[PDB]
């Protein structure tokens with residue numbers, strides 16, 4: 544049994560109180576108060592539509608994925624990754640796909656900087672989408688469950704779905720459950736063919752073991768995964784540490800050339 548699986552069982556043992564104290568212990572998170580207030584008033588400039596704009600920003604500002612050209616955003620939800628990429632100088636097109644409907648977030652229209660190169664499309668199940676030419680492949684799909692075997696299957700399905708989109712392009716792909724042995728085997732095969740590394744984002748909650756497979760990096764996958772399981776296990780053992788609060792992103796306004 545893996546370190547990750549032991550973490551999961553401990554997480555499933557927690558009360559809602561213990562869980563709520565645990566999920567943010569020691570993490571980093573952005574302050575959404577201003578954005579939530581302005582979005583509630585219908586403002587369409589400056590605000591990120593979700594915490595996701597800041598999450599992708601963390602990887603980009605570290606050169607782990609460098610978005611360029613035609614960007615595909617699989618599972619875009621409200622659009623936080625798509626709107627963020629739309630303001631980056633090398634990006635020329637952003638196409639987001641998400642399921643919508645009951646249980647799922649719908650794209651939110653915005654006029655943040657570069658909005659004119661974004662098209663977000665709801666009613667799209669990516670597991671039925673034919674792959675398209677693109678220079679950056681982004682994917683943030685993976686629903687948590689209390690069952691890690693369910694999570695194993697959802698993770699493997701995503702990795703099998705993304706591979707035909709990958710053709711010597713930039714990428715950032717969520718790996719919901721990276722500690723199950725079968726997932727490891729797949730990731731190791733994928734890194735051999737397409738390179739990259741798995742990376743833990745500091746803005747991810749302790750309630751998920753998600754890691755992101757990014758195109759610009761090298762490293763040992765098993766080692767990076769076990770380090771996260773050790774980190775998440777250690778955070779059970781202490782009284783809640785309040786999260787390191789950071790400033791949310793300002794996505795600006797206006798068209799781009």
Ligand SMILES: C[S@@+](CC[C@H](N)C(=O)[O-])C[C@H]1O[C@@H](n2cnc3c(N)ncnc32)[C@H](O)[C@@H]1O
Pocket residue numbers: 592593594595596617618619620621622623624625640641642643646647648667668669670683684685
């Ligand atoms: C964590 S959210 C992504 C957030 C987004 N990156 C942002 O910045 O706001 C994951 C999204 O994937 C969508 N999703 C889940 N399964 C999907 C599927 N099979 N096809 C398309 N979208 C899916 C969910 O509805 C959800 O909106």
